[PDB]
RNA sequence: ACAGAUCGUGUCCAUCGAGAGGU
DNA sequence: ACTCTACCGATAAGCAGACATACCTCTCGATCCTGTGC
């Protein structure tokens, strides 16, 4: 036997998926947040990774 | 450059105002018309200009 | 002459700061 | 020959400017009024 504990991090509270959801006002870009059906951010690092891959389209 | 950027154009004599899309209205919880800081600054500039014109 | 109640579709509650987090 | 003082270059030393990995999650507050009116 060994003592084990359950942490506050569950997969049910972390799974997210967006496909043309709610829209912002100022920047007209997808909103942020799982609670308000947000979209993941394509950061700069992913941009240079795609550039190095050569996938321009 | 004599065509695109003259030296005398660095002095502000006619300040354009951004359109409402640049400075939208924040709806905010409960029916209150919260406004952007740019609108308040533009109103302040207009008030200062009117005061200067009247004082002159 | 003509000269309407709503109906039918309806868009969200935002911003600024502070704290706690986890790879 | 270098005194009476001027611009040339070559530094010392203080005055400010810009900025700090990336990803997302959650909660919690605040967004005005006091002197002045008849």
From Swiss-Prot, chain A:
Protein name: DNA-directed RNA polymerase II subunit RPB2
Residue numbers of the full-length protein present here: 1089 to 1145 of 1224
Disulfide bond annotation, renumbered to this chain: none
Function, as annotated: DNA-dependent RNA polymerase catalyzes the transcription of DNA into RNA using the four ribonucleoside triphosphates as substrates. Second largest component of RNA polymerases II which synthesizes mRNA precursors and many functional non-coding RNAs. Proposed to contribute to the polymerase catalytic activity and forms the polymerase active center together with the largest subunit. Pol II is the central component of the basal RNA polymerase II transcription machinery.
Miscellaneous section: The binding of ribonucleoside triphosphate to the RNA polymerase II transcribing complex probably involves a two-step mechanism. The initial binding seems to occur at the entry (E) site and involves a magnesium ion coordinated by three conserved aspartate residues of the two largest RNA Pol II subunits.
Cell compartments where the protein resides: Nucleus
Family of this protein: Belongs to the RNA polymerase beta chain family.
Subunit structure: Component of the RNA polymerase II (Pol II) complex consisting of 12 subunits.
Curated annotation (Swiss-Prot), chain B:
Gene: RPO21
Range of the intact protein held here: 225 to 280 of 1733
SUBUNIT field: Component of the RNA polymerase II (Pol II) complex consisting of 12 subunits. Interacts with DEF1; the interaction is direct and serves to bridge RPB1 to the Elongin complex in a DNA-damaged dependent manner. Interacts with the Elongin subunit ELA1. Interacts with the Elongin subunit ELC1. Interacts with ASK10. Interacts with ESS1. Interacts with RTT103. Interacts with SHE2.
Subcellular location: Nucleus
Homology family: Belongs to the RNA polymerase beta' chain family.
Source organism (scientific name): Saccharomyces cerevisiae (strain ATCC 204508 / S288c) (Baker's yeast)
Post-translational modification: The tandem 7 residues repeats in the C-terminal domain (CTD) can be highly phosphorylated. The phosphorylation activates Pol II. Phosphorylation occurs mainly at residues 'Ser-2' and 'Ser-5' of the heptapeptide repeat. The phosphorylated form of Pol II appears to carry, on average, one phosphate per repeat. The phosphorylation state is believed to result from the balanced action of site-specific CTD kinases and phosphatases, and a 'CTD code' that specifies the position of Pol II within the transcription cycle has been proposed.
UniProt comment concerning the protein's domains: The C-terminal domain (CTD) serves as a platform for assembly of factors that regulate transcription initiation, elongation, termination and mRNA processing.
Stated name of the protein: DNA-directed RNA polymerase II subunit RPB1
Taxonomic path: Eukaryota, Fungi, Dikarya, Ascomycota, Saccharomycotina
Function text: DNA-dependent RNA polymerase catalyzes the transcription of DNA into RNA using the four ribonucleoside triphosphates as substrates. Largest and catalytic component of RNA polymerase II which synthesizes mRNA precursors and many functional non-coding RNAs. Forms the polymerase active center together with the second largest subunit. Pol II is the central component of the basal RNA polymerase II transcription machinery. During a transcription cycle, Pol II, general transcription factors and the Mediator complex assemble as the preinitiation complex (PIC) at the promoter.
Region (Lid loop): 24-36
């Amino acid at each position: 036997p060994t003592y084990y504990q359950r942490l506050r991090h569950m997969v049910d509270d972390k799974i997210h998926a967006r496909a043309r959801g709610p829209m912002q006002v100022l920047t007209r870009q997808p909103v942020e947040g799982r609670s308000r059906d947000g979209g993941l951010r394509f950061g700069e690092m992913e941009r240079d990774c795609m550039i190095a891959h050569g996938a321009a389209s | 450059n004599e065509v695109f950027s003259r030296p005398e154009w660095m002095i502000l004599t006619c300040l354009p105002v951004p359109p409402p899309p640049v400075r939208p209205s924040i709806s905010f919880n409960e029916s209150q018309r919260g406004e952007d800081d740019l609108t308040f600054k533009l109103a302040d500039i207009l008030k200062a200009n009117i005061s200067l014109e009247t004082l002159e």
